[PDB]
């Protein structure tokens, strides 16, 4: 097993996956690492099993159809994994905790949003459809763009959104286009 957390790339108190060489801090894994369960399999392994049980799940899909899906266990898992993939980028630190807004020439967004709030939302089963989760995620980056305006710091929002969108297209097998 790896000696660093797969998500934050730091050492510490790690839990090791029994079916692959990854390890995680307790609260870096999503969902949080389960108390007992031996063996334990991490979210990467659980996502791989879904694909292996239903190979046709990887054929291309329309984004509009994916968003209307109800949050049954498998879609819940996919959204957990997608969130995890955003936390895996170190630039996610900017979007993790609750932001505040006091900048000359800007006003704060009407509906603030941040990764830990989406984390809690998923944990408390507050989304009924994929759409709810995807709208909150995209809102994080859109609030950022709008607030920081022409400051170069806007680019951090573009960068983290690109990681989200790539991972969304992969995990949910969105049909490739030009
Ligand atoms: Zn970690
Ligand atoms: Zn694993
Ligand atoms: Zn089948």
Short mmCIF file of C-alpha atoms in Angstrom, two decimals, residues 16-131:
data_model
loop_
_atom_site.label_atom_id
_atom_site.label_comp_id
_atom_site.label_asym_id
_atom_site.label_seq_id
_atom_site.Cartn_x
_atom_site.Cartn_y
_atom_site.Cartn_z
CA UNK A 16 -5.44 1.06 3.36
CA UNK A 17 -7.65 -0.38 0.64
CA UNK A 18 -7.74 -4.21 0.54
CA UNK A 19 -8.24 -4.48 -3.23
CA UNK A 20 -5.76 -1.85 -4.54
CA UNK A 21 -2.66 -0.10 -3.27
CA UNK A 22 -4.39 3.25 -2.26
CA UNK A 23 -4.60 4.69 1.20
CA UNK A 24 -6.65 7.59 2.60
CA UNK A 25 -7.06 9.74 5.56
CA UNK A 26 -10.37 9.05 7.32
CA UNK A 27 -12.11 12.25 6.04
CA UNK A 28 -10.30 12.58 2.72
CA UNK A 29 -12.08 9.41 1.53
CA UNK A 30 -15.64 9.99 0.44
CA UNK A 31 -17.68 8.64 2.02
CA UNK A 32 -15.55 8.72 5.25
CA UNK A 33 -13.71 5.45 5.87
CA UNK A 34 -16.06 2.85 7.34
CA UNK A 35 -15.53 1.81 11.04
CA UNK A 36 -15.24 -1.95 10.62
CA UNK A 37 -15.51 -3.99 7.30
CA UNK A 38 -12.57 -6.35 6.66
CA UNK A 39 -11.78 -6.45 3.85
CA UNK A 40 -12.42 -2.80 2.93
CA UNK A 41 -12.57 -1.55 -0.66
CA UNK A 42 -12.14 2.20 -1.48
CA UNK A 43 -14.28 4.24 -3.81
CA UNK A 44 -11.91 3.75 -6.76
CA UNK A 45 -12.41 -0.05 -6.44
CA UNK A 46 -16.17 0.29 -5.94
CA UNK A 47 -16.45 2.42 -9.12
CA UNK A 48 -14.40 -0.13 -11.07
CA UNK A 49 -16.74 -2.92 -9.98
CA UNK A 50 -19.81 -1.06 -11.25
CA UNK A 51 -18.16 -0.76 -14.67
CA UNK A 52 -17.14 -4.43 -14.68
CA UNK A 53 -20.62 -5.63 -13.75
CA UNK A 54 -22.18 -3.53 -16.59
CA UNK A 55 -19.68 -2.91 -19.43
CA UNK A 56 -22.37 -1.16 -21.50
CA UNK A 57 -22.46 1.50 -18.71
CA UNK A 58 -19.39 2.95 -20.55
CA UNK A 59 -21.22 3.59 -23.85
CA UNK A 60 -21.77 7.33 -24.47
CA UNK A 61 -24.62 9.20 -22.77
CA UNK A 62 -26.28 12.57 -23.18
CA UNK A 63 -25.62 15.01 -20.32
CA UNK A 64 -29.33 15.87 -20.21
CA UNK A 65 -30.26 12.24 -19.48
CA UNK A 66 -27.53 11.82 -16.82
CA UNK A 67 -28.66 14.95 -14.90
CA UNK A 68 -32.28 13.67 -14.63
CA UNK A 69 -31.20 10.45 -13.03
CA UNK A 70 -32.44 9.84 -9.53
CA UNK A 71 -29.85 9.51 -6.78
CA UNK A 72 -30.05 5.74 -6.36
CA UNK A 73 -27.03 4.09 -4.65
CA UNK A 74 -24.94 3.88 -7.85
CA UNK A 75 -25.45 7.50 -8.88
CA UNK A 76 -24.78 8.58 -5.25
CA UNK A 77 -21.49 6.72 -5.45
CA UNK A 78 -20.55 8.29 -8.74
CA UNK A 79 -21.22 11.78 -7.37
CA UNK A 80 -19.11 10.95 -4.24
CA UNK A 81 -16.27 9.87 -6.56
CA UNK A 82 -16.54 12.96 -8.76
CA UNK A 83 -16.37 15.16 -5.64
CA UNK A 84 -13.41 13.20 -4.45
CA UNK A 85 -11.64 13.77 -7.80
CA UNK A 86 -12.03 17.54 -7.32
CA UNK A 87 -10.53 17.34 -3.77
CA UNK A 88 -7.59 15.44 -5.29
CA UNK A 89 -6.40 18.63 -6.98
CA UNK A 90 -4.44 20.88 -4.61
CA UNK A 91 -6.25 23.96 -6.03
CA UNK A 92 -9.47 22.62 -4.38
CA UNK A 93 -8.22 24.27 -1.16
CA UNK A 94 -9.58 27.58 -2.46
CA UNK A 95 -13.10 26.19 -2.80
CA UNK A 96 -13.25 23.90 0.26
CA UNK A 97 -14.52 26.03 3.08
CA UNK A 98 -17.08 28.82 3.34
CA UNK A 99 -15.99 31.88 1.47
CA UNK A 100 -16.55 35.52 2.24
CA UNK A 101 -16.79 38.52 0.00
CA UNK A 102 -15.48 42.01 0.63
CA UNK A 103 -13.68 43.41 -2.41
CA UNK A 104 -13.85 46.92 -3.83
CA UNK A 105 -15.99 46.98 -6.95
CA UNK A 106 -17.65 43.56 -6.45
CA UNK A 107 -20.68 42.21 -4.70
CA UNK A 108 -20.88 38.68 -3.17
CA UNK A 109 -22.96 35.96 -4.95
CA UNK A 110 -26.61 35.50 -3.96
CA UNK A 111 -26.01 31.87 -3.26
CA UNK A 112 -22.65 31.01 -1.90
CA UNK A 113 -21.40 27.48 -2.31
CA UNK A 114 -18.34 25.47 -1.35
CA UNK A 115 -16.97 21.91 -1.54
CA UNK A 116 -17.54 21.03 2.14
CA UNK A 117 -21.15 22.10 1.91
CA UNK A 118 -21.60 19.76 -1.16
CA UNK A 119 -19.82 17.08 0.86
CA UNK A 120 -22.31 17.45 3.71
CA UNK A 121 -25.19 17.61 1.31
CA UNK A 122 -24.21 14.31 -0.23
CA UNK A 123 -23.68 12.77 3.17
CA UNK A 124 -27.14 13.86 4.41
CA UNK A 125 -28.77 12.58 1.11
CA UNK A 126 -30.12 16.02 0.20
CA UNK A 127 -29.87 15.58 -3.54
CA UNK A 128 -32.65 13.60 -5.27
CA UNK A 129 -31.15 13.84 -8.73
CA UNK A 130 -27.69 14.12 -10.24
CA UNK A 131 -28.69 17.52 -11.52
#
